[PDB]
Design a protein around this ligand. Structure first.
Ligand SMILES: O=C1c2ccccc2C(=O)c2c1nnn2-c1cc(F)c(-c2cc(CO)ccc2F)c(F)c1
Ligand SMILES: Cc1cc2nc3c(=O)[nH]c(=O)nc-3n(C[C@H](O)[C@H](O)[C@H](O)COP(=O)(O)O)c2cc1C
Ligand SMILES: CCCCCCCCCCCC[N+](C)(C)[O-]
Ligand SMILES: O=C(O)c1cc(=O)[nH]c(=O)[nH]1
Ligand code: NA
Ligand code: NA
Ligand code: NA
Length: 365
């Protein structure tokens, strides 16, 4: 455990990063993971890490965020890495290449990344067939407390965003435990403007109608993923629409187009979304706000700058029922998943919580 953790963190990852540009490193990471080339995590999930939410059991509350496995190529390897749930995507209706390279940048002095991938996607059909090939295996994983999420995007050239998302619901909804719609990615022109109210209500109404039209055993939960860059007005409006329509949950947050003071990385002024440590507390505060605006009745998946048990517990106590990480993986490697789970378990005990469920939203009480 702590042996692999230190080896990856101090030696192997700094070396990989010295040899490989970030996008090449990402591609290699997906390849290794899809082949299961990683230590089968020794950390046995204890009962106090179990969470029941979104109509499912989650064996542990630490998931892999969208954007690592964009095309559904490494799902089983990610469960092997120890994640309690996996979110693939974003997936767009038609295949598209995304932005010109370079489009991924490391800020090692900040333990941050900036990306402007631009929703590079193999497309719905390819991903549909990839998930169909392991559909029953996933059904068993889900039953064993390891659910699957699918994050849905829209094509750059799309005329009607709601129809892109509707297509995604129809094609991948039947293969997902939950679906995600972003009103929040920084690298598709106009996508975030889907955050405005009457239009947002229209969009989400259509998504939920399409979801409700699926057969019962193929009917996923629907979550909305938001950026940390919203105005107070935006957040109020989203909370209101979410409650009005019966949206099943929120993912809080995507990357930030802000550049917090104090960034040291040479590449800090590259265009794109910033992730990792400089996002951490901006994310946590957005969770805190959305939890309060929804009266703690809307499940939140908390994400942004998590790389320790303390980071995870801060988001849970702020209102998250589950958390995700991504950027920590790119600095610490696979051992970071077991690290976060072990540290989280220890902190729950230390603070007198019977388990994760007891800690959800505890700061508000
Ligand atoms: O800058 C980025 C980056 C930037 C943006 C997105 C992703 C990444 C990203 O994934 C990454 C970066 N630098 N290194 N990695 C990286 C992270 C890993 F976890 C592995 C890895 C290793 C093993 C060996 O057992 C097994 C499974 C693995 F995934 C890996 F090989 C490379
Ligand atoms: C390289 C990269 C690609 C991403 N791609 C997506 C994506 O396709 N869809 C999405 O909803 N979020 C995407 N994200 C955002 C992550 O899901 C997550 O919300 C964010 O990175 C914050 O978590 P972290 O600080 O642990 O990385 C991406 C993030 C990174 C770093
Ligand atoms: C309140 C705005 C603050 C913006 C971002 C804050 C970053 C906190 C620094 C701790 C991160 C640890 N490290 C190694 C990456 O520097
Ligand atoms: O594909 C991308 O550029 C991307 C999508 C998203 O939702 N978030 C992010 O940081 N990048
Ligand atoms: Na399935
Ligand atoms: Na389902
Ligand atoms: Na405002």
């Amino acid at each position: 455990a702590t042996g692999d953790e230190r080896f990856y963190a101090e030696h192997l990852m700094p070396t990989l990063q010295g040899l490989l540009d970030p996008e090449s490193a990402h591609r290699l990471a997906v390849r290794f993971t899809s082949l299961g080339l990683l230590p089968r995590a020794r950390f046995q999930d204890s009962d106090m890490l179990e969470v029941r939410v979104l109509g499912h059991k989650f064996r542990n509350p630490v998931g892999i965020a969208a954007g690592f496995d964009k095309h559904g190529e490494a799902v089983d390897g990610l469960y092997k890495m120890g994640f309690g749930f996996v979110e693939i995507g974003s997936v767009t209706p038609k295949p598209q290449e995304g932005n010109p390279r370079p489009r991924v940048f490391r800020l090692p002095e900040d333990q941050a990344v900036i990306n402007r991938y631009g929703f590079n996607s193999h497309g719905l059909s390819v991903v549909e067939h990839r998930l169909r090939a392991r559909q029953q295996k996933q059904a068993k994983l889900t039953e064993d407390g390891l659910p699957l999420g699918v994050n849905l995007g829209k094509n750059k050239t799309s005329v009607d965003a709601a129809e892109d998302y509707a297509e995604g619901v129809r094609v991948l909804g039947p293969l997902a435990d939950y679906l995600v719609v972003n009103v929040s990615s920084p690298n598709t022109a106009g996508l975030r403007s889907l955050q405005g109210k009457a239009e947002l209500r229209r969009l989400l109404t259509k998504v939920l109608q399409e979801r409700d039209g699926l057969r019962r055993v193929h009917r996923p939960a629907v979550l909305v993923k938001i950026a940390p860059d919203l105005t107070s007005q935006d957040k109020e409006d989203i909370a209101s629409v979410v409650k009005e329509l019966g949206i099943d949950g929120l993912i809080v947050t995507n990357t930030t187009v802000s550049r917090p003071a104090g960034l040291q990385g040479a590449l800090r002024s590259e265009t794109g979304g910033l992730s990792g440590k400089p996002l951490r507390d901006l994310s946590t505060q957005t969770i805190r706000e959305m939890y309060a605006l929804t009266q703690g009745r809307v499940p939140i998946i908390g994400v942004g700058g998590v790389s320790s048990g303390q980071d995870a517990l801060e988001k849970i106590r702020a209102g998250a029922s589950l958390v995700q990480l991504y950027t920590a993986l790119t600095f610490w490697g696979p051992p970071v998943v077991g690290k976060v789970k072990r540290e989280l378990e220890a902190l729950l005990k230390e603070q007198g919580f019977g388990g994760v469920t007891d800690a959800i939203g505890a700061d508000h009480r």
